């Protein structure tokens, strides 16, 4: 028998808090978008076996959304968007393990569509981080 | 504008204006023969025509019904014709009563107690008789994925019908990208109507009320510890499918004090007072779906 370092643990309690914050913010504002799909490992059972899959997919969605909120759609025509953008980044930064390099008008309508879709995604993320924080630790 | 609804049932699309010319329909008997054939409508022995085909005019709901062909005393085939009336570009919706709540033109209301893939839809009608409802559902429209529904049955009374459906391949924890479609066929005598509903399960979530709501008075103080549990219908594990709560303390009167607290815990300490009740309701923690009904308990 041996015992071997497995690397840095995900920061579950911080991610739990940032993802909860993001849910609050996304609802404070009343295609090929990534979605946490069923294959993605984010379900309760999928988290025990291997959470890297899920977290990696969550990271991907976070960076997709942060690019959208920083883009022309939100800084052009006529707010929780500033704090939302920054928190999207904060969380994605927490997910990025050392060594891994996981980084790669009509507006009022688009902005409604994007924010609605963001609410959905961040709720899944919040459940993942809350479950991980509670059962993996 | 004429299509098969089910075996031997055909819907005729009827564009109507007061001087309706009437659309002509040709009905063919479902038989290998063409001799000795007569036609009757519904329960009458009156011969309306002879031979393998019958040509009829449809202008109004009485122009329809179960046309039947006969040879040697024997029924060869039945063809029931229903009419879907398009007033002036718009189809009729007399059968179901607008609920007027989520938006206007909302005839079907669906809700789910959890993320399992089971949901319930209901609808309202004034009509008490000669009523059949048929329910279909799927996830997506491009390549529909299976959802199994039961029979629509009278559930309460205005007339209320409900149906239970279950997504065949549920993924409770996923972020849904394609909505569930609900299609209800509504038949009143010979009047056919369509009803449709589109949604994400996440948006029709309404949990059941908090369970086992109970009070625990503090020693020689007015304060009470309120405690409760997640409903049994709620998705498990709770560590993942979190709920959040609203605790309310209110009197019977108008101008009396009110106390309202938000908490992710399943306990709270409130101040009780004679003739006040403690109410607790629930909502998904991370997504702003519908609050449960109140569970409540008198300060007694
Ligand atoms: C409902 O009615 C309309 C017109 O009759 C038709 O186009 C549509 O296909 C019907 N829907 C179903 C699901 O049968």
Residues of B in contact with A134 (CB under 8 A): 239
For residue B15, list its beta bridge partners: B86
The answer to whether B286 contacts chain A (CB < 8 Å) is yes
Residue A87 belongs to what H/E stretch? Answer: helix A81-95
In angstroms, rounded to a whole number, what is the distance separating the alpha carbons of residues A124 and A33? 15
Q: What is the DSSP letter of A11?
A: -
- Last residue in a domain, options B141, B176, B204: B204
Q: The CATH number of the domain where A84 resides is what?
A: 1.20.1250.10
DSSP assignment of chain B? -EEEEETTEEEEEEE--SS---EEEEEE-SSS--SS-EEEETT-----EESSEEEEEESSGGG-EEEEEEETTEEEEEEEEEEEEESSSSB---SSPP--SSSSS---EEEBSSSSSEEEEEEEES--SSEEEEEEEEE-SSS-EEEEE---EEEE--EEEEEEEEETT--TTS---S-EEEEEEEEETTEEEEEEEEE-HHHHB-PPPPEEEEEEEPTTSSEEEEEEE--TTS-S-TTTS-EEEEEEEEESSSSS-EEEEEESSSEEEEE--TTEEEEEEEEESSS--PPPPPEEEE--
The residue among B198, B231, B174, B230 whose CA lies nearest residue B119 is B198
- Last residue in a domain, options B85, B120, B147: B85
Q: Which of A37, A127, A135 sits opposite B286 (nearest CB)?
A: A127
Residue A24: both structure tokens together: 């609050």
Cα B151 to ligand 1 centroid, rounded to whole Å? 19
Claim to verify: residue B56 and residue B123 sit in the same structural domain: no
Claim to verify: residue B251 and residue B269 sit in the same structural domain: yes
Side-chain-side CA neighbours of B166 within 13 Å: the count stands at 5
In angstroms, rounded to a whole number, what is the distance separating the alpha carbons of residues A43 and A68? 26
- Pick among B167, B240, B243 to test the A interface (most A CBs inside 10 A): B240
- Last residue in a domain, options B161, B176, B204: B204
CB contact under 8 A, A121 and B175: yes
Q: The CATH number of the domain where B8 resides is what?
A: 2.60.40.10
Domain carrying residue B78: 1-85
- Which strands sit side by side in the sheet containing B295-298, from one edge to the other? B258-263, B243-251, B276-284, B295-298
Domain carrying residue A67: 1-137
Claim to verify: residue B213 and residue B249 sit in the same structural domain: yes
Claim to verify: residue B185 and residue B267 sit in the same structural domain: no
- C-beta separation of B192 from B186 below 8 A: yes
Side-chain-side CA neighbours of B184 within 13 Å: the count stands at 32
Residue A15's SS3 state is: helix
C-beta B134 within 6 A of ligand 1 = no
In angstroms, rounded to a whole number, what is the distance separating the alpha carbons of residues B2 and B4? 7
Contacts of residue B196, defined as CB under 8 A and 6 or more positions apart, other chains included, come to B108, B181, B182, B183, B184
- C-beta separation of A119 from A38 below 8 A: no
Distances from the Cα of B272 to the Cα of B224, B258, B259, B281, B298, angstroms:
6, 11, 10, 18, 9
- C-beta separation of B78 from B30 below 8 A: no
CB contact under 8 A, B240 and A130: yes
Cα B195 to ligand 1 centroid, rounded to whole Å? 9
> For residue A99, with 0-12 CB atoms within 10 Å meaning exposed, 13-18 middle and 19 or more buried, which class applies?
exposed
In-domain check, residue B141: yes
CA B196 to chain centre: 9
In-domain check, residue B31: yes
In-domain check, residue B57: yes
In angstroms, rounded to a whole number, what is the distance separating the alpha carbons of residues B78 and B143? 33
In-domain check, residue B99: no
Count of domains for chain B:
3
Count of domains for chain A:
1
Residue A101's SS3 state is: coil
Q: What is the DSSP letter of A28?
A: T
Claim to verify: residue B178 and residue B191 sit in the same structural domain: yes
State in Å, rounded, how far the first CA of chain B is from the last one: 66
Structural determination approach: X-ray
In angstroms, rounded to a whole number, what is the distance separating the alpha carbons of residues B134 and A67? 46
In angstroms, rounded to a whole number, what is the distance separating the alpha carbons of residues A27 and A116? 8
The answer to whether B242 contacts chain A (CB < 8 Å) is yes
In-domain check, residue B98: no
Claim to verify: residue B121 and residue B80 sit in the same structural domain: no
Contacts of residue B111, defined as CB under 8 A and 6 or more positions apart, other chains included, come to B119, B120, B204, B205, B206, B290
Residues of A in contact with B237 (CB under 8 A): 44, 131, 135
Interface of A with B (CB under 8 A): 20, 23, 27, 33, 35-38, 40, 42-44, 119-124, 126-128, 130-131, 134-135
In angstroms, rounded to a whole number, what is the distance separating the alpha carbons of residues A122 and B7? 47
Claim to verify: residue B220 and residue B187 sit in the same structural domain: no
Residue B275: both structure tokens together: 């003739």
Q: How many CB atoms lie within 10 A of CB B45?
A: 7
CA distance A64 to chain B (A): 15
Claim to verify: residue B114 and residue B174 sit in the same structural domain: yes
Side-chain-side CA neighbours of B150 within 13 Å: the count stands at 14
CB contact under 8 A, A44 and B288: no
Distances from the Cα of B36 to the Cα of A72, A88, B48, angstroms:
76, 78, 14
């Amino acid at each position: 028998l041996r015992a071997v370092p497995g690397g840095s643990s995900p920061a579950w309690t911080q991610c739990q808090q940032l993802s909860q914050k993001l849910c609050t913010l996304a609802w404070s504002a009343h295609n090929d978008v990534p979605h946490i799909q069923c294959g993605d490992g984010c379900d309760p059972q999928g988290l025990r076996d291997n959470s890297q899959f899920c977290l990696q997919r969550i990271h991907q969605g976070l960076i997709f959304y942060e690019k959208l909120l920083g883009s022309d759609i939100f800084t052009g025509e006529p707010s929780p968007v500033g704090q939302l953008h920054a928190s999207l980044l904060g969380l994605s930064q927490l997910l990025q393990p050392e060594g891994h390099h996981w980084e790669t008008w009509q507006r009022l309508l688009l902005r409604f569509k994007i924010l609605r879709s963001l609410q959905a995604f961040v709720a899944v993320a919040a459940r993942v981080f809350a479950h991980g924080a509670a059962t993996l630790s | 504008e004429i299509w098969e609804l089910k075996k031997d049932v055909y819907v005729v699309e009827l564009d109507w204006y007061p001087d309706a010319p009437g659309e002509m329909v040709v009905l063919t008997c479902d038989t290998p023969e063409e001799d000795g054939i007569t036609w009757t409508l519904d329960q009458s022995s009156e011969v309306l025509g002879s031979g393998k085909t019958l040509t009829i005019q449809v202008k109004e709901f009485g122009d329809a019904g179960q046309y039947t062909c006969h040879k040697g005393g024997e029924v060869l085939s039945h063809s029931l014709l229903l009419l879907h009336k398009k007033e002036d570009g718009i189809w009729s919706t007399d059968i179901l009563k607008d609920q007027k709540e989520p938006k206007n033109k909302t005839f079907l209301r669906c809700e789910a107690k959890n993320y399992s893939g089971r949901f319930t839809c209901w609808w309202l009608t004034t009509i008490s008789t000669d009523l059949t409802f048929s329910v279909k559902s799927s996830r997506g429209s491009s390549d529909p994925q299976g959802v199994t529904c039961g029979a629509a049955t009278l559930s309460a009374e205005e007339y209320e019908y409900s149906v239970e459906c279950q997504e065949d391949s549920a993924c409770p924890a996923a972020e849904e990208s394609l909505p569930i479609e609900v299609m209800v066929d509504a038949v009143h005598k010979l009047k056919y109507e369509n009803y449709t509903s589109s949604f994400f399960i996440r948006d029709i979530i309404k949990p059941d009320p908090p369970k086992n709501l109970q009070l625990k008075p503090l020693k020689n103080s007015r304060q009470v510890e309120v405690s409760w549990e997640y409903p049994d219908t709620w998705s498990t594990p709770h560590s993942y499918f979190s709920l959040t709560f609203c605790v309310q303390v209110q009197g019977k009167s108008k101008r009396e004090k009110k106390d309202r607290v938000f908490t992710d815990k399943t306990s709270a300490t409130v101040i009780c007072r004679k003739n006040a009740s403690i109410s607790v309701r629930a909502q998904d923690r991370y997504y702003s779906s519908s609050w449960s009904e109140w569970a409540s308990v008198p300060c007694s």
